[PDB]
Amino acid sequence: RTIGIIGAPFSKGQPRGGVEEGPTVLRKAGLLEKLKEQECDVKDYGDLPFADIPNDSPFQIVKNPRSVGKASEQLAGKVAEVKKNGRISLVLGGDHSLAIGSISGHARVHPDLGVIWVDAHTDINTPLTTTSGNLHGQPVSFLLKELKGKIPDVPGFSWVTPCISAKDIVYIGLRDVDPGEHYILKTLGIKYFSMTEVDRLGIGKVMEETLSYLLGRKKRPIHLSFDVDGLDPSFTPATGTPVVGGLTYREGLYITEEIYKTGLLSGLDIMEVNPSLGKTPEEVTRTVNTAVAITLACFGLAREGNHKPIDYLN
């Protein structure tokens, strides 16, 4: 398989700036070379240059709407180009608002994609249900057709056309869902496995049911949007909205190892890594190292091991 890296050093979907350092620290960790060690022809499309939008006052309670909207608009273009190039897109975040542009761009070339969303949160607040006003907790509401008519015309987002159905997304890892978001989940009949389901079934059954749900009818490309706070803070502490009782390192690698095995991975997001929020140098390396490992598993690095198609014993 071939890979296209896109850096997205953007943070205006939330208050803390350091998340725009995600792509820098992920590359410093040797991600490109490590990808190249696997079954990968890898091209770096570099970091997106997100021009400042100094005039961007809140839309109602919604913060930095033009900056967020433009960044996702730009991102969508790059993703779509990467996809036209026949490559799997790898977006390095950056805050999670960017999924608006990443999924959009992906869906331009592969309208039939299904989404697996790994996260402690549902990120499905509308501009009218959000309490925080932070757009990184709203991206999914912008993408789902079933919610069009519930998203106001927000400055910066006129270009958005919700092209994804509520029935084509699965959540894994949920453990902090706003009441408005829970209402939306139940109302639209969205498939999810909160931490309660993971505890009940085991990550094994979870992935079986997730892949069966998305791929049962027919094969179709997979978009994995991975928020690092989906994993427990003991593995990814350097992130903006940590929530205890998260997925383990092991469960994280399991999810992605199983997704690799489908051979349908088409787009990937690695989001919300914020080195500024590491309490110590070790917390930063711990968070980045975990992020890197999740990424490699998506592209074939397996715990049981890997080998080239040759005779190693001769």
Added chain:
Amino acid sequence: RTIGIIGAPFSKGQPRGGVEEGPTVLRKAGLLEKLKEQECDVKDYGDLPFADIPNDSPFQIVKNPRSVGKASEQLAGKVAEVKKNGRISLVLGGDHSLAIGSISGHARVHPDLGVIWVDAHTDINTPLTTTSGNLHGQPVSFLLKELKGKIPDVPGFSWVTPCISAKDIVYIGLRDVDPGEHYILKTLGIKYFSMTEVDRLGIGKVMEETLSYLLGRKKRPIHLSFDVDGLDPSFTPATGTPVVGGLTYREGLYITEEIYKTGLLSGLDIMEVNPSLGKTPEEVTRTVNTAVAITLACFGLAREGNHKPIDYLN
């Protein structure tokens, strides 16, 4: 549902005094208000005033028997009143000897209750099998009918009538059981899931089997006596008798989330929280925060999220 809080700042069931601070720190953590945020009409019956009994020399090897006996005697009265008031009793410990009074009082109003006991220990030593002499490791022996005739007349406990059958209790979390206690388990045929069973089956199957065991024949009220050392010390370090390899935070919330879903929770104990034993301020907050979370789950706080019966989208 309606709730009745009872503080039980008592420690004479064991050597370390700080456990009598349990109710203070649990309330300081905002427990009442957080309960009120859920489907709860909550009333605080305050903290029990446990008068000193200066003259309380050991009965054989058994320590502080009159103090322990009186405290449980008082507790039983309060629990029974809370129960007559139609409310779920919430006892904030306090050492685990208090379960003698809590379960007793509960059973006065609901003779048909079943008990789920979450703990690293079985707390089923008799006054004659105990090695420590600490009564917090003996409460279950005082309650089981099948053991009457094996409990001597201990000062302070004349009021006790064992009204619970060995067949109506399930242990979850066991990993440090005295040889005498193990004999009693096997001999009375008590249902248990030690950590070995949890590892084997998964907490999912565990709760399925636990609830089937207690509720199969017919619905009946549930009493949950939760010792915080049931959870691994990495989540509840500030407790008197920590034992490694415990239940996870996740497993803890799972147990209680499933118990909530039955709609049969009738009495709850949150025991052995001792802030004095926290190695650092963070260990204390970690322990208290975990205790609070377990409590909220018992009353409906779910990881997948919660919402009121209204249209959130309008």
Added chain:
Amino acid sequence: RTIGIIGAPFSKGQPRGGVEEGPTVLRKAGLLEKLKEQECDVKDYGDLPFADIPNDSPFQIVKNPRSVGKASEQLAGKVAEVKKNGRISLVLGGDHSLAIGSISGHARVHPDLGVIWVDAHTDINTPLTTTSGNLHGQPVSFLLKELKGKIPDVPGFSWVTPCISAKDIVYIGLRDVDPGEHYILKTLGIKYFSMTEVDRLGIGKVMEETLSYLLGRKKRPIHLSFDVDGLDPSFTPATGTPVVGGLTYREGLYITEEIYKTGLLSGLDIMEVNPSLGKTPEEVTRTVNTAVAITLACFGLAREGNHKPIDYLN
């Protein structure tokens, strides 16, 4: 059952010397007495005296080959004697290269043994596939009949006769396997449960399948070679080659508790404990304490508890 302890303070199978302190720290922890507390008649055959071999230059890339070879040669003799004495052999490592001698010696008396290998690594590099040259990452290649013809004549190892079949070994815990090793796994059809399989199935199913695989056809002695780095570094940090995402303390006790229950445990290795590598005094005690607990479980210490065949209630 009866037990024979053998100390193997040897480290030349790898670069770090402190692993030769394994037997000292394991005994200081009270292992002998604790074994004696269980169903054990225990004899200490002491620590093997491994004479220096000052002249031991690398064979090709393979390091300290004569020292490693002699130590395993000596170890095999002691194990075989312990086995002739009708006792379960308990080898305290020491680096993992010693499994060459331990398994060999065991197999002299019990040719029909099956091996369970708990480890983050497969330790199945040949002298010609190894990258490190460290012999502790090669012991299994010396033992398997199917690989004879692929192991060159290495100084110090002329005494080795591979008497174990690839079909009679199961790995549990794998998460860092060299490409050459992965080739060997797939090629010889070796049964393994890497961490991916553990995540998928649960340690319960894992042990069921492991024991069924080795014991289905007929009963036969079990040799457990336990590398402490099989467990996550959060439980055994003081070890030479830690790898994240390991087996839990709980999973560790589960494996060994199930192995005890078969009544077929015949040989045991407790390897790669290196107190020098503990970052703090607590890391050393944590590592040693975990090592001790795994050991006791192998000999009957159960989490649900233990009791003698007597009436404890009278």
